[PDB]
Enzyme design. Sequence first.
Site, short mmCIF file in Angstrom:
data_model
loop_
_atom_site.label_atom_id
_atom_site.label_comp_id
_atom_site.label_asym_id
_atom_site.label_seq_id
_atom_site.Cartn_x
_atom_site.Cartn_y
_atom_site.Cartn_z
N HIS A 139 0.82 -1.22 0.00
CA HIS A 139 0.00 0.00 0.00
C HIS A 139 0.86 1.27 0.00
CE1 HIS A 139 -3.17 -2.85 1.15
NE2 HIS A 139 -2.38 -3.25 2.13
N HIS A 180 6.39 6.67 6.23
CA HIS A 180 5.93 6.22 4.93
C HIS A 180 5.33 7.43 4.24
CE1 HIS A 180 2.36 5.96 7.52
NE2 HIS A 180 1.73 6.38 6.44
N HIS A 197 2.25 8.95 1.23
CA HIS A 197 1.11 8.79 0.34
C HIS A 197 1.34 9.75 -0.82
CE1 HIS A 197 -1.13 6.69 3.60
NE2 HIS A 197 -0.39 7.49 4.35
N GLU A 227 -3.18 13.39 1.86
CA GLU A 227 -4.36 12.93 2.56
C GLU A 227 -5.04 14.10 3.25
OE1 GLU A 227 -3.09 9.31 4.79
OE2 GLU A 227 -4.05 8.35 3.06
N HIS A 259 4.28 10.69 6.54
CA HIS A 259 3.81 10.39 7.88
C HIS A 259 4.91 9.73 8.69
CE1 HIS A 259 -0.62 10.23 6.36
NE2 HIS A 259 -0.19 11.47 6.55
N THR A 291 -5.00 6.33 8.77
CA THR A 291 -5.68 6.59 7.50
C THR A 291 -5.75 5.35 6.61
OG1 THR A 291 -3.68 7.28 6.33
CG2 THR A 291 -4.89 8.98 7.57
O1 LIG Z 1 -0.47 4.82 6.02
C1 LIG Z 1 -1.14 5.07 7.07
N1 LIG Z 1 -1.00 6.41 7.52
S1 LIG Z 1 -0.87 6.39 9.13
O2 LIG Z 1 -2.17 6.75 9.71
O3 LIG Z 1 0.19 7.31 9.56
C2 LIG Z 1 -0.50 4.81 9.47
C3 LIG Z 1 -0.10 4.14 10.71
C4 LIG Z 1 0.15 2.78 10.68
N2 LIG Z 1 0.54 2.06 11.90
C5 LIG Z 1 0.75 0.72 11.96
C6 LIG Z 1 1.07 0.43 13.32
C7 LIG Z 1 1.41 -0.94 13.91
O4 LIG Z 1 2.66 -1.27 13.36
C8 LIG Z 1 2.77 -2.53 12.85
O5 LIG Z 1 3.75 -3.29 13.62
C9 LIG Z 1 5.05 -2.62 13.69
C10 LIG Z 1 6.08 -3.65 14.10
O6 LIG Z 1 7.41 -3.01 14.13
C11 LIG Z 1 5.49 -1.88 12.42
O7 LIG Z 1 6.81 -2.33 11.99
C12 LIG Z 1 4.59 -1.89 11.25
O8 LIG Z 1 4.49 -0.52 10.75
C13 LIG Z 1 3.22 -2.43 11.42
O9 LIG Z 1 3.16 -3.76 10.83
N3 LIG Z 1 1.03 1.64 13.97
N4 LIG Z 1 0.71 2.58 13.10
C14 LIG Z 1 0.00 2.03 9.51
C15 LIG Z 1 -0.39 2.66 8.33
C16 LIG Z 1 -0.64 4.07 8.35
ZN LIG Z 2 0.05 7.41 6.33
#
Ligand SMILES: O=C1NS(=O)(=O)c2cc(-n3cc(CO[C@@H]4O[C@@H](CO)[C@@H](O)[C@H](O)[C@H]4O)nn3)ccc21
Ligand SMILES: [Zn+2]
Length: 258
Positions: free
Chosen positions: A62, A92, A94, A104, A117, A196
Amino acid sequence: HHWGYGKHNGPEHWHKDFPIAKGERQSPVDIDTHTAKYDPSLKPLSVSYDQATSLRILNNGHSFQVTFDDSQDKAVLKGGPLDGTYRLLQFHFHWGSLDGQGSEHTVDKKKYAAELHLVHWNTKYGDVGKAVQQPDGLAVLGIFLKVGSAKPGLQKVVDVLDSIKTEGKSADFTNFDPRGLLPESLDYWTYPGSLTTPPLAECVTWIVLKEPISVSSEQVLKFRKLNFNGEGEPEELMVDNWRPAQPLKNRQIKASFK
Ligand SMILES: O=C1NS(=O)(=O)c2cc(-n3cc(CO[C@@H]4O[C@@H](CO)[C@@H](O)[C@H](O)[C@H]4O)nn3)ccc21
Ligand SMILES: [Zn+2]
């Protein structure tokens, strides 16, 4: 089947698997700058990234993410609207298929070419899995990207993307300094919101910086060469991996600046 950004599995479909999609504090939102209220009681953001330890870069189907060692207070966000200490876990992006979309959050309905983000979690909950189940579990620092001059601190990221072209590919990505991605000003807007992406958990204090960074057309073009698909599947370019603005509902966006 799996959620994504296509016609049949995109944001308008997500509520079927994740009903919180229609919840009371969903993200992103449009930031109406003339309605945001200046809050003089907001502290300056404290961004302490000097000891950051990046580990890996990953195409997760994604977006792509750079992950950090979050087993110690090495790269932390404090102050601003936050209570306590938030550890950097990953960042990461978008982005869009064209320069006029991709972010976003929007600012007075303006879309940027992309949005960075930086995801942090509240150390008082011990691990990020616990933190996502709390209303104040995460703090995400959002930074807009516009296209113009290159961002030198981004170049190490874009140069390795050809090695993680497809879903599931990862690479070693050590000694990357995320300070090279920050604009001059830490002026920000803040509001309570959500992830998001699914599961869209309502666990995020959003901190969105007022000043965009500029990236070059060549840099963002490299984002757009990534693939949603896995190796050996029909190629679908990873573009327009953004959720659109959601209803503000019963929320006030606060500004750190006049
Ligand atoms: O793209 C979106 N924009 S966002 O709102 O900023 C967001 C947050 C998250 N988060 C995922 C997590 C839990 O993390 C998991 O486990 C750990 C293990 O180290 C991570 O390495 C791995 O990122 C994920 O698999 N906390 N926030 C995922 C996608 C988005
Ligand atoms: Zn994000």
